[PDB]
C-alpha cells in the first residue's frame with residue numbers, strides 16, 4: 001500500500017538530490033537506493049577519495065592565499081575571558097551558546113578573538129594593509145537543527161588599514177562566491193549579510209567599531225564570517241545541513257548506514 | 259655585563275635554529291633578532307602565505323589520497339561512551355586526560371573511535387581492502403610541556419582486510435616519513451613505535467586486537483597514529499613543540515611578540 005512516514009524518512013536518508021509515487025513497495029525502493037548509494041561511495045573510493053568538507057577548505061584556502069591573505073591556524077580551545085571581551089555578557093543570545101571547558105576555557109563560537117589578537121601583533125611586523133584569514137571548527141549550542149550545527153566550520157577573513165571600504169569588501173565576497181559557484185545577494189559600523197534565499201551564508205562588517213579598542217585595534221578594517229557547511233549545503237543542494245557536517249552518519253552527503 | 263636568565267629566555271623566544279657569547283649587550287642582541295624575525299614574517303607574507311600546520315596537513319592528505327586511502331572528516335566533539343568503549347576505564351592514564359564537555363560529551367583524545375565506526379559502516383559498501391585516514395585536532399590534559407600539547411593535531415590511517423601485515427605497515431610508514439624528509443627508527447597484537455631519538459612520532463598497531471569486537475570489527479587491520487606538531491618540530495628543528503602548535507604566540511615557529 002502507501003508508504004508510512006517512517007519508511008519515507010528512511011528513503012529520504014538514502015535519497016540524493018539528483019535521484020529520480022508509483023506502484024513500487026518499500027523493499028524495492030529501498031533496495032534500489034541502497035544500490036545507488038553504495039556505487040556512489042565506490043566511485044569516490046576509486047577516483048578522488050577527498051572529503052567535501054576538507055576539499056572546500058583547501059579550495060577556499062587557495063583562494064585567499066592567492067589574493068594576499070595570510071593563512072592562520074589559531075587555538076580552537078580559547079580562554080573564557082575572550083568571550084567577555086567580545087562583548088558577550090549574560091544578556092546576549094550567544095552567552096547561552098558557549099560550550100565551556102574546565103573553569104577558564106571554552107570552545108570558540110567564532111574566529112574573531114584569535115584574529116583580533118593576530119591583527120594587533122602582526123601590525124608591528126607587516127606592511128599596510130594587513131590581510132589574514134582562518135578556517136576551522138567552531139562551536140555553538142543551537143536549538144535549531146535544519147540550518148544549524150553545534151559543531152561547524154567557519155571561514156573568517158580580515159583586511160586592516162588601507163582600502164578597507166564597503167565596495168572592496170563586497171568585491172571580495174562577490175569574487176569569492178562566484179569562484180565557488182554559489183548564488184547570493186548582499187543585504188545592507190556597516191553590518192552586511194550574505195544571503196542565499198532565507199539562508200544566511202555570511203555576516204560581514206565594515207569597521208572600525210567601538211569594540212576594536214578592547215583588543216588594541218586602532219585602524220579601519222573589513223571582514224566576513226562564512227559557514228562552510230552552509231556553503232556545501234547550497235552548492236550540493238543538500239536539504240539538511242547535517243549532510244555537510246563532520247559526521248559518522250554522512251560521507252560527502254551520502255548516508256553511511258547502508 | 260653577562261645576560262640574566264630572563265634576558266636569555268627572551269632572546270631564545272626570538273631565536274630561530276638557523277641563527278648564528280660576545281661583547282654584545284641585550285638591547286643590541288634583541289634589536290637584531292627582532293629585525294630578523296620581522297623580515298621572516300614579511301617574506302612569508304610576500305611569498306607563500308601558508309601556515310606550516312595547515313600546509314603539512316595538505317601534504318599528508320595528498321600522500322594518503324594518492325596511495326588509496328579515503329579522507330575522513332569526523333566529529334571532534336564525541337560521545338563520552340566512546341571513551342569507555344575504547345577500554346579507557348578509571349585506572350588508565352588516559353582516563354584523567356579527558357576534556358569533558360557537558361554530561362555526555364568530550365573532546366576526542368584520539369581518532370580511533372570515529373575511525374572504528376567508519377570501518378564497520380564502509381565494509382558494507384566498499385571492496386577489500388578498506389583504506390581510510392583522518393587528520394584533525396585532538397585533546398589531552400598533559401602534565402608535560404616540552405613534547406606535549408593539550409591541543410594537538412593527529413594523523414591516523416588504517417587499512418582493513420587484505421594485506422594487513424607488519425611488513426606492509428612498516429612500508430607505508432617508511433614511504434611516508436621519507437616523503438616528508440624526517441629521520442626515524444621503528445621499535446618493535448603487534449604494537450610498534452616510530453621514534454626520532456627519544457621522541458615518539460607514532461604508535462602503530464597490527465590487528466586484530468580483542469577490542470575490535472566492541473566496535474563490530476571482525477577483520478585483520480594495520481594502523482598508525484602520528485602527531486603533526488611533533489612531525490613539524492623534528493622537520494623544523496624546533497626546540498619546543500609550542501612553536502608548532504595552533505598558537506597566538508608563534509606563527510610558523512616565529513614569535514609573534516615583536
Ligand SMILES: Nc1ncnc2c1ncn2[C@@H]1O[C@H](COP(=O)(O)OP(=O)(O)OP(=O)(O)O)[C@@H](O)[C@H]1O
Pocket residue numbers: 110140142147148149150152154200201202203225226227228229230
Ligand atoms: N550553528 C551554526 N551552524 C552552521 N553555521 C553557522 C552556525 N552559526 C553560525 N554559522 C555560520 O557562521 C557565519 C557567521 O557567524 P554569525 O555569528 O555571523 O552567524 P549567526 O547570525 O549567529 O547565524 P544564524 O543567525 O543563522 O544562527 C554565519 O553566516 C553562518 O553561516
Ligand SMILES: Nc1ncnc2c1ncn2[C@@H]1O[C@H](COP(=O)(O)OP(=O)(O)OP(=O)(O)O)[C@@H](O)[C@H]1O
Pocket residue numbers: 368398400405406407408410412458459460461483484485486487488
Ligand atoms: N599531548 C600530545 N601532544 C602532541 N602530540 C601527541 C600528544 N599525545 C599524543 N601525541 C601524538 O599522537 C601519537 C599517537 O598517540 P599515542 O596515544 O600513540 O601517543 P602517547 O604514547 O600517548 O604519547 P606520549 O607517550 O609521548 O605522551 C603519538 O605518537 C604522538 O606523536
Ligand SMILES: N[C@@H](Cc1ccc(Br)s1)C(=O)O
Pocket residue numbers: 110111112113115116154156157158203205223224225226
Ligand atoms: N563574524 C566572523 C568574521 C569576523 C568579523 C570580524 C572579525 Br575581527 S572576524 C567571526 O566572528 O569570526
Ligand SMILES: N[C@@H](Cc1ccc(Br)s1)C(=O)O
Pocket residue numbers: 368369370371373374412414415416461463481482483484
Ligand atoms: N593510535 C591512533 C591510530 C589508530 C590506531 C588504531 C586505530 Br582504529 S586508529 C588513534 O588512536 O587514532
Ligand SMILES: [Mg+2]
Pocket residue numbers: none
Ligand atoms: Mg546564532
Ligand SMILES: [Mg+2]
Pocket residue numbers: 200202203
Ligand atoms: Mg550573523
Ligand SMILES: [Mg+2]
Pocket residue numbers: none
Ligand atoms: Mg600520553
Ligand SMILES: [Mg+2]
Pocket residue numbers: 458460461
Ligand atoms: Mg603511544
